[PDB]
Structure formats: C-alpha cells, structure tokens
Symmetry: D2
Subunit: 255 residues, 4 copies
C-alpha cells in the first residue's frame, strides 16, 4: 500500500557535499524540502550560503560549511560541524568529486587528484560519519559516481578509473557497514546539464549524445535529486550496494 | 525541489501480470493506492478477483482477468480487455514468470518453458501494449527479472539464462521504444518472502541466505512494490534501460 | 616453463558446428592443423565438403556432416555420426548461430528463430555431447557468442537477448558440467570480416566501427580461431565459464 | 591455420615486476623459455637473481633488478635499466601489487597503500614504458588484477576497490594507447597456490574455496603464466582492453 510519508525525509539530518551548485544544490533543496535538516558543504562559500537562504525561504532548515573534501582535516571538521548543528547525521550524500578528461601523459599529480576527489575523500568521510550512524542504529550513505565507471574511451584514464574505484567501494562498503545497519548506494549520472557539463561539451558533442539517448533529452539535476531521494528514503530500506544509472537509457560521451 | 505529485500515479492505467499473490499483488495494491486504475491479471482468477476486492475496499479502481501469460491468444485478450476497461494503457508491470532450479539433463520441454515464462511472453505483450502507449504519448514497461541473471550456480541453466535474456531485452528494447517515449526498466529481487521462495527455501538455506545479506532481513513484497512505483513514476522520467536490484546488499542463493 | 605441446590438440576429437565458412571454417582448419581430428558440420553440404578437402591436403583428418543445428533430430544424429567417425568427442565448438538485426515489430516467429539458433541448439547439443565427455573423464565446450550480448542498441532485441542467454548459460553450465570435469567458455567477437558481416555492413558503418576500435583494424577469422585454440587447449585447463571478447579493444555497431 | 611461431615470444623484450616468486616468477620463466629476453624485477634482489639463474640454466636471457614498484624514482630506474640491458621494450607484465583484507576502520595510510601498490605504480610504469614500445612499432602491457575487482565482501574496501580501478584502467588505457599500437589487457586470477594465498588461507577456507570451484583444484602459477603468454603473444593481436579470469569456473573467497 502506497504511503507518501515513506518517500520523505522528515526528521532526517543530512550532510550534502559539494552542495552549492548543480546536482549538489538540487539534492540539498529537494531533501530539505522533503523534511530533512541539511548541512550544505561547498568550497565556494558564497554558493554554499546562497543555497541555505534558498532553503530557508522554502521553510527549510540548513547550515553552511566551507569545506574542501580534499583535506582530511577539513573533513573531520565538517563532520563535527554537522553533529553540532544537526545533532546527529542520518544521511551522507557524497556529491563532490571531479577530475575530468586528461591525456595519457598527464603529470602523475593530475592522475592522483582524481583519486583524492573521487575516492579518498568519499572513503574517509564515510569513516568519520559511520560511527555516528551506528550509534543511532542506522543511516544511509549515497555517492554520486559516474557512467565513466562503465564507459571506455580515450582521455579518461584518471576520471574513469577513479569513479570505478568509487562504484566498487560501494558494493563492498555495503558489507562492512551493513553490520552497523548502514546502506550504501551510488547514482551514476549521464550527461547532466550543468556548468561542469557545459565546460567540456561542444554543440556537436551534445548532438552525438542526444542521438544515442533513447529518451531524447539531456539530464536535469532534478532527475538525480529524485533518484537520490528514493535511494535515501525509507522506501528503499532493503536497497544497498547498488549504483543507479540515470541516463535516458543511452550513452553520452565526449570522444 | 520535492514534488509529491511526481511520486504518484494519478489517472494512469496499469496492466499487471501474475498479480494474484506475492510481489505482483503488492505492486497492484501500491499502484492503485497511488492513484492508478489497474488490471489484475493472473492464471488464478479467484486470486485475481480477491486482489480486486481489496483494491476496491481501499478505494481504488481495478479489474480482474484470468490470463496465462504463456499463450499469445491469451495475451492479446489481456491487452484488449485492459483497453476496453481502462480506455488506455500507461504502464505494464510484467511480473508473472518463473521456472526455477532444474538438473542439466532436464527435457528440452522444461528448458524451453523457462523462455516461454520469462522471455517470449514478456516480449510479445510489449509488442501488444507499445502501440497503445505510443498513442497516449509514452508509457513505462517494467519487468520483474532476477538475481539469477547475474549469479552463477549449479541447477540454474534454464532459469538463469532466461532471466538473463529478459534483462538484456530491457536494455535493448529501451532503444526501439525510446522514440515512442516509452521507458523500459526491470527489477531483480533477492529473496523475497513469498510462497515461491517458501516452496524452495529451508531453514538451513534460510540461514545461509541471511548469512550473506548486509541488511540482515529477508525481503518483503513491499520492497519490490516501492521500487516499482518509483521506477514507473514521473520521478524516474530519465531512467530507462536499467535493472535495479533489491537484495539488501547481498546475495541469497540456494547453494 | 613454456611447452609447445600444450597449445596443440594432438589426439583430440572435435565437433565443429557451422564449419563450412567464416569463423567456423578457420577454427576447423586451425584445429585439425594443431593435431585434432575434426567433424565439419554445416547446412551447406558443399561448403562442408570443401573444408574437409582443404584439411586433408594439409595432412588433416576430417569428416563432413550435413546437419542443421536447428533440428533436435539432426542434432542427436550429428552427435552419433561424430562418435562413429571419431571414436570419442573431446571438444564441442558451437559456432553456428545467427539471427541479426530485427525491428521491434518483427513477427514472433522471427523473435523465436534467434533463440533456436543461438540458445536451444547450443544447449541441446551440449546435453547430447556431455555424456560422452564425462565417460572419457573430461572435455571442453566452446560457443561463439557475440558482443551484442553486452551492447545496447536499436533493432537488436532478438539477436542481443539471445546471445545474452547464450553467454549466461555458459557461466552456469560451467557448474553443472564441472562435476563431469567439463569446461565451458565462449568467445564474443566484434566486427569479424565475414560475408555475414558484409551483408549488413555499409562503407560508412565500417568507418564508424574502425574509429571506435583502438587497434585500428577489422577482425579476421584467425583471431577467433587463435583464441578458440587457446581456450580449448590444455594450456587453459583452469579456465571455465568465461567469455573472451576479441574486438581490438573497441566497439563495432551498426546503429 | 595453426602457426606455432605466433605463440612464441622470439626476440621480444619483457619487463616483469614482482617476478621473484609466485605468479611473476613463472611468467618470467615461461616467457624466457618461449623466446623472450626478460628483466626480472622484484623488491627482493636475492629472489630476483635466483630466478635469473634458473632462466639462464634453462638457456634464456635474463637480468635481475631490485625495484620497489611503489617509488617513482625506482620505476624510472627500472625502465632505464631495462633499456640499457635489453635495448628496447616490447612487453610489460605488471604483476607486483597486493594489499589484502583490511577492516573498515583502517588508517587512511593503509587504504592509500593499496592504490600505490595496484594503481598508481602500474599507471606510471605504463607512462614510462609506452614511448619505448611506441618507437618499436607497438607492444603489450599486461596487469595481474584480481577477482576482488568484481567480488563483493566484507574487509575488502581498499583491496577490492583498487583492483577495480586497475581493471578499469586497462579498459580505458587500451584507447589512449591503441594508436601507438600497444595492446593492454589484464588477468584476474582466482586462488593460485602461492605463498600470498598460503598466508591468508586455512584448511576450512581451503575447503569452502574448492567447494565452489567447478574445476575442483586450486590454481597453479603455470595457469596464469599460460594465459599471460597467449595474451602477450602475436596470437592475441586483436585482443585489447580485456580482463581474462582464471578461476576454474568458480569463486574462491575468504568469507
Ligand atoms: N554534470 C554532469 O554531467 C555529471 C556529473 N557527475 C558527478 O557529479 C558530481 C558533481 O556534479 P556537478 O553538480 O555537475 O558539478 P559542479 O562542478 O557544477 O558543482 C559542484 C560543486 O562542488 C564544489 N566543489 C568542487 N570541489 C570541491 C571540493 N574539493 N571540496 C568541496 N567542494 C567542492 C563546487 O564549488 C560546486 O559548487 C561529481 O562527482 C561529478 O563527477 C557525474 C555524471 C555527470
Ligand atoms: N519471491 C522471490 O523470492 C522472487 C521472485 N522473483 C520473480 O517475481 C515474479 C513473481 O514471483 P512471486 O511473487 O515471488 O511468486 P508467487 O508464486 O508468490 O506469485 C506468482 C503469481 O503469478 C501467477 N502466475 C503463475 N504462472 C502464471 C502464468 N503462467 N500466467 C499468468 N500468471 C501466472 C501465480 O498464480 C501467482 O498468483 C517472477 O518473475 C519471479 O521470477 C524474482 C526474484 C525473487
Ligand atoms: N562475422 C561477424 O562479424 C561475427 C559473427 N558472430 C557469430 O559467429 C557465428 C558465425 O559467424 P560467421 O562465420 O561470420 O557466419 P557465416 O554465416 O559467414 O558462416 C556460418 C556457417 O554456418 C552455416 N549455418 C547456418 N545456419 C546453420 C544451421 N542452422 N545449421 C547448421 N549450419 C548452419 C552456414 O552455412 C555457414 O557455412 C554466429 O554465431 C554469429 O552469431 C559473432 C560476432 C561477429
Ligand atoms: N596467488 C593468488 O592467490 C593471487 C594473486 N594475485 C595477484 O598476483 C600478483 C602477485 O602475487 P603472487 O604471485 O600471488 O604473490 P607472492 O607474494 O607469492 O609474490 C609476490 C612477489 O612480488 C614481490 N613484491 C612485493 N612487493 C613488491 C613491491 N612493493 N615492489 C616490487 N616487488 C614486490 C614479492 O617480494 C614477491 O617476490 C598481485 O598483483 C596479486 O594482487 C591475484 C589473485 C590471486
Ligand atoms: C569536465 C568535468 C570535470 C571538470 C573538473 O572537475 N576539472 C567532468 C565532470 C563530470 C563529467 C561527465 C560525467 O561524469 C558523465 C559522462 C561520462 C562519460 O564517460 C564521459 C562524458 C560525461 C558527460 C562526463 C564529461 C566530463 C565531466 C563533465
Ligand atoms: C522456485 C521459484 C520458481 C517456481 C516456478 O515458477 N516454477 C523461483 C522464483 C524466484 C526464484 C528466486 C530468485 O529469482 C532470486 C534468487 C536468485 C538466486 O540466484 C537463487 C535463489 C533465489 C532465491 C531464487 C530461487 C527460486 C525462486 C524462488
Ligand atoms: C546480419 C548477421 C546475421 C545474418 C543472419 O543470420 N540472418 C549478423 C550475425 C553476426 C552479427 C554481428 C555480431 O554478432 C557482432 C557485432 C555486434 C554488435 O552489437 C552489432 C554489430 C555486429 C558487427 C553484428 C552485426 C550483425 C551480424 C553480422
Ligand atoms: C593476502 C594477499 C595480499 C598480501 C599483500 O600484498 N599485502 C592477497 C593477494 C592476492 C589475494 C587473493 C586474490 O586476489 C584472489 C581472491 C579474490 C577474492 O575476492 C578473495 C580471496 C582471494 C583468494 C584473495 C585473498 C588475499 C590475497 C591472497
């Protein structure tokens, strides 16, 4: 029997990483707007504060944090800030990441940054949060991975390998955290219409993309926010260790 | 931003196969309860009708039909009836199927049966239903596949390969139909506490199953129903060609 | 330590299906030429006889059979012919199959033929052969599946779903047959330069193909024959339930 | 037609990491015995030198080098030495790696270590070696990955995700390098009877492992060596981006 309250986050406290823009922002708004008290972490503090305002006008409860996911020290801080403002953490939404297209001969420092962004931060923040969740009797961690973790193409060595590590960590973390009654899932988005996408997309690339997408349209952040809501809601209580690909049933690549 | 109406099925018409018991019955109820008019199909008309009464008790619109999915004559009948009672078709939830464990030396008749129940029936009904949806401007086809489509084990030649063919149909069919604005997805459930499982499970197998499930509890029909609602709802508008697995982050196998 | 005799089929008897042309032919020649006595089954008897001649001049041992894989009755016959001519069967190479691109609204008879060709024949011949292999203490079955079993595109519903069932049967048959000390593997070829490929390939399609293939070249039957030799040789004695994709590291599609 | 010369490595130059024992030692021997001049690298120079003597005893060309793959300074040294002794590089068999089972609460230092051993080292050496190969007109890079790259279980966060990143590198790297005519592949072995396994295995775990292996015997170094020879030979010329799994058709896990 359908029950609208099971698709809502009433009384849940969520840390949302890289929430000042794009997919991240929409998840924050969609979550707070579904009953969750949200902490908005972003490196661009201005963006982070704007979202909080947006949420508050909407009748939401939000706090801002100027964290850089790529800093162990700023991570444990964000984690402390969250428990202080919220009181507890129930949902971790690891959205921040990145890296992008890089040539085979890129410097190893470039190769390494994608792992800091996409794997190490995600895993370390999970470590910092899990103990709280366990203490409350359960929680949910969701990471925004990528379809690059499944695709094969040129100039994607760093990005694609890092997101693959991110998606597989998910399948395995689901075991270690399952004992603590924590669920871990990820969403793998396709061509989402974001500034991030705009910086690397050419008018022809877009077209090639659209012609390989059955549902002829480019993704909007809400598509990802809608899926994040479901995966983090009590309606998905027996869903763990999964990666949901939101891509119109197609494939969108640059090369 | 969270919009509750996108998670409901108001004014949609759904045909559901094998909805007399287990998983299908709950999808039927959850859907009718979420605003859809449903056609409860099953090879057991008594069961089909009982589900119909319950839906009506809950205040929903529903019609019962006795259809054996393994007959093309019976599938057309099912499509016709659905149309004459509903006036249109917006959603197909192809749930009936089965086959189960079988020795390698099984008669070809038993091997082929698995395909009749899980592949040919499902493909053909989509052929029947597609044109109706197409004219309404789109629709959603959903199939209840299986973890066996990915697992490997002894005594599963017929069952596992057929479910694997069904899961790959979803991926390709998503292309042919993306043009008619029809989305196609599937759900592969783990051990769901239903009589089909109760028929093959034992206390030892039971324990071994829970022994490998991170979220330590067997699945409930509602879990599948919850996922089916999201997948068939407006909120999953850009999700096509996917097979979502509901297994508590683990695997439940017989061996 | 390398040992050339481990990559040879000296004293092995192999049934090669659809061996009168393309990939099939090359496997026959490459096998007989590596020490195996070969039975050449094909529906085009003339082609089947030509290959036998070719093999004999080369100093090979071969027999022809005019079998249609899509006939239970011709299958048990082929199996009997093989044991009579060869004395025993050690290697089953299920190469015959087919079907090709079909539209969503194809007749169900067309949908069903791909399964006869790609799944049912393969599974039934395996049943007919396994008992011999068991009797000898072991054997190897190899099927030629396809990359369509992994790819998603339009007009591939029947072909792609059937080959997927074929590839997954492999993963599972490896269990049932493993007790009998039988190994089951498959090879999934990409754009192999065959008349079969020529009938559905356009000059532009070819180019698109080549530009998505890292090893810029189209496959030759020998590539598949070389891989079949390894998979069926004693050097691969602990390799079972695998599908080796030979595709220059790329993807080759029509749509 | 079968051509034995295509299965040999005559006049090729191969660098092999961690070749002092186990799997790497056997690849070294098999390769030198198949006609290649090899550079036995290992963090244990005694071991490296012992392998060199054996290869020379068997009549092959080989050189020992003490390299700890987790140091960029040491990898360049390894590439330089290989070139000054061999004159060119035709094959890279990146075998050294490791990490193993680790609790979820492990220090980030241990999590990151897994990446140093399985991902960064391997990617960087390919950067070093690629230009050498490129000039000879092509080459082959092969990595010894793992089944953990696909399995899911408890205590494998660091180990499994890193191997998963390495396996996906192979898939993408195959693209960047397909142009230089370099092929990239990997082998994911099951339980191979080597001391690394002997360090983690127990008689009970032993039994459970064989309990799920169709071809009921633990793997031997030669099995991996046999597959590596084929993959790095002229016979696999159109095989790139693949990860071949040698596991006897089953899975050997610790839990
Ligand atoms: N836009 C697209 O097409 C797709 C994006 N993704 C993934 O989605 C995630 C984010 O996507 P978008 O919203 O498009 O990105 P975006 O770049 O538009 O916005 C991300 C937000 O993250 C913040 N940020 C960046 N680095 C940070 C750091 N080191 N520490 C803390 N905050 C940081 C930025 O200030 C920004 O406000 C990434 O993990 C990306 O890999 C995956 C598939 C598609
Ligand atoms: N419960 C479980 O453990 C799992 C079930 N499944 C799948 O869920 C689907 C439904 O199974 P459950 O609800 O568990 O089983 P169930 O046996 O409890 O219910 C099946 C319903 O379908 C009807 N049905 C059977 N054959 C039919 C036919 N030939 N034509 C029309 N209707 C027919 C039955 O009469 C019954 O009412 C199947 O596709 C099965 O493969 C997949 C994974 C797990
Ligand atoms: N050519 C290509 O690009 C690729 C082919 N494949 C697969 O390889 C297999 C064969 O490929 P090709 O050698 O290119 O085909 P082909 O059509 O060139 O030759 C196949 C041989 O099979 C025979 N044959 C057809 N139906 C038969 C039947 N019903 N019973 C007995 N014999 C029959 C034909 O007479 C012919 O001599 C098929 O399973 C196909 O799905 C997979 C990937 C690529
Ligand atoms: N034997 C098994 O059960 C399996 C092993 N593997 C993989 O096979 C590869 C090799 O392992 P085995 O032969 O089994 O192990 P092993 O422990 O028997 O041999 C490893 C060799 O690599 C050397 N080595 C270790 N660290 C090194 C470093 N930091 N730099 C340079 N050389 C180093 C060791 O001294 C030793 O000589 C690894 O990538 C491992 O992940 C994968 C699956 C199974
Ligand atoms: C270029 C930016 C990253 C910029 C940065 O962080 N530096 C990255 C981040 C998200 C990436 C996208 C994705 O993750 C989704 C998608 C994955 C495909 O394999 C490649 C295209 C495509 C559409 C990616 C293109 C490159 C994007 C847009
Ligand atoms: C025995 C019945 C089929 C009966 C029939 O329709 N004929 C089937 C239908 C669903 C099947 C289950 C699933 O599909 C899910 C699961 C998949 C695993 O690989 C094996 C166990 C397990 C738990 C299956 C055992 C057999 C079940 C319970
Ligand atoms: C059209 C013919 C079948 C004709 C028939 O049997 N009738 C089929 C058989 C083998 C098929 C090919 C393959 O199996 C390999 C490959 C798979 C891709 O997903 C589609 C293209 C591509 C290259 C296929 C094109 C269609 C082919 C050439
Ligand atoms: C313990 C050592 C690593 C030691 C190290 O380098 N540090 C590792 C290296 C290879 C590993 C094995 C594999 O990679 C293969 C296999 C993969 C399964 O998912 C788990 C068990 C199993 C059998 C692994 C157990 C742990 C092993 C034996």
């Amino acid at each position: 029997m359908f029950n609208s309250d099971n698709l809502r986050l009433d009384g849940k406290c969520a840390i949302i990483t890289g929430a000042g823009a794009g997919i991240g922002k929409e998840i924050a708004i969609t979550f707070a707007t579904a009953g969750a008290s949200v902490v908005v972490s972003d490196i661009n503090a201005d963006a982070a504060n704007h979202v909080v305002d947006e949420i508050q006008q909407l009748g939401g409860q939000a706090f801002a944090c100027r964290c850089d996911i790529t800093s162990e020290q700023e991570l444990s801080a964000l984690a402390d800030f969250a428990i202080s403002k919220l009181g507890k953490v129930d949902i971790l939404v690891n959205n921040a990441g990145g890296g992008g297209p890089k040539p085979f001969d890129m410097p190893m420092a470039d190769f390494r940054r994608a792992y800091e962004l996409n794997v190490f931060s995600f895993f370390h923040l999970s470590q910092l949060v899990a103990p709280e969740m366990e203490k409350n009797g359960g929680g949910v961690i969701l990471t925004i991975t990528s379809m690059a973790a499944e695709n094969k193409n040129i100039n994607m060595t760093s990005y694609a390998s890092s997101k693959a590590a991110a998606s597989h960590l998910v399948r395995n973390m689901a075991f270690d955290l399952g004992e603590k009654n924590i669920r871990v899932n990820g969403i793998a988005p396709g061509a989402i219409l974001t500034d991030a996408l705009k910086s690397v997309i050419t008018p022809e690339i877009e077209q090639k993309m659209l012609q390989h997408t059955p549902i002829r349209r480019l993704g909007q952040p809400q598509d990802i926010a809608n899926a994040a809501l479901f995966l983090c809601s009590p309606a998905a209580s027996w869903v763990s260790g999964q990666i949901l690909t939101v891509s119109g049933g197609g494939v969108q690549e640059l090369n």
